[PDB]
């Protein structure tokens, strides 16, 4: 029944590695490394807990990629948001994506916002309200994390025209200039000696990739408050 938010600490590595596995389910990304990297920059991380009694029920952090260039997980991700683009890109967005990723006039920060389905969606409004202030403070102090001008968000979605898993990222979608979708649905195998197999998944779990300009953020908050208001 009760939720609160704390800075990332070492305590939280396991629960936040669990959430990150749920995002990159079979991806090459080394979530151990990514988790380690988020906790180190505790000056922008928030972790949600419910009131043994210290399990991580969700988390939120922003990682500035252009700034951490060279890094294994950072690399593995940039390589995966491109390789899945090529399978759905039309060859022009593969061109816009690689150029956004390496711009350095406008670095790109990865937004990570993953929670357990338990937690009521309305929590999103405090959670983003807090992140924004953490962004302002880090942009006063010229930290990497506030210098970023593009938000790269990767959303759990699916189609039963598309459902969002967290459900407030829909407001992030309609402001994203470059967007596309890749299936994360696992392929079916021929258990019973057939020529091919098909699985009746009314869900088609997928992952929507979104790039958002930083300035449209203020306007996305405007839609969070009205829709998510108590």
From Swiss-Prot:
Gene Ontology terms describing biological process: DNA repair; establishment of mitotic spindle orientation; microtubule anchoring; microtubule cytoskeleton organization; mitotic spindle assembly; mitotic spindle organization; neuroendocrine cell differentiation; regulation of cyclin-dependent protein serine/threonine kinase activity
Source organism superkingdom: Eukaryota
Chief place where the protein resides: nucleus
Record localization: Nucleus; Cytoplasm, Cytoskeleton, Microtubule organizing center, Centrosome, Centriole; Cytoplasm, Cytoskeleton, Spindle pole
GO molecular function: kinase regulator activity; RNA binding; tubulin binding
Region Interaction with BRCA2, residue ranges: 3-99
Tissue: Expressed at high levels in testis and skeletal muscle and at lower levels in brain, heart, kidney, liver, lung, ovary, pancreas, placenta, and spleen.
GO CC terms: centriole; centrosome; cytosol; mitotic spindle pole; nuclear cyclin-dependent protein kinase holoenzyme complex; nucleoplasm; nucleus
Modified residues (Phosphoserine): 197
Keyword Acyltransferase appears in the UniProt entry: no
Stretch list, region Interaction with CDKN1A: 93-175
Keywords, comma-separated and alphabetical: Cell cycle, Cytoplasm, Cytoskeleton, DNA damage, DNA repair, Nucleus, Phosphoprotein
Note: HT1080 cells that constitutively express low levels of BCCIP display increased levels of spontaneous single-stranded DNA and double-strand breaks.
Function field: During interphase, required for microtubule organizing and anchoring activities. During mitosis, required for the organization and stabilization of the spindle pole. Isoform 2/alpha is particularly important for the regulation of microtubule anchoring, microtubule stability, spindle architecture and spindle orientation, compared to isoform 1/beta. May promote cell cycle arrest by enhancing the inhibition of CDK2 activity by CDKN1A. May be required for repair of DNA damage by homologous recombination in conjunction with BRCA2. May not be involved in non-homologous end joining (NHEJ).
Subunit structure: Interacts with BRCA2, CDKN1A and MTDH/LYRIC. Isoform 2/alpha, but not isoform 1/beta, interacts with DCTN1/p150-glued and ACTR1A/ARP1. Both isoform 1 and isoform 2 interact with alpha-, beta- and gamma-tubulins. Interacts with TENT5C; the interaction has no effect on TENT5C poly(A) polymerase function.
Family from the record: Belongs to the BCP1 family.
Name recorded for this polypeptide: BRCA2 and CDKN1A-interacting protein
Complete-protein stretch covered: 61 to 314 of 314
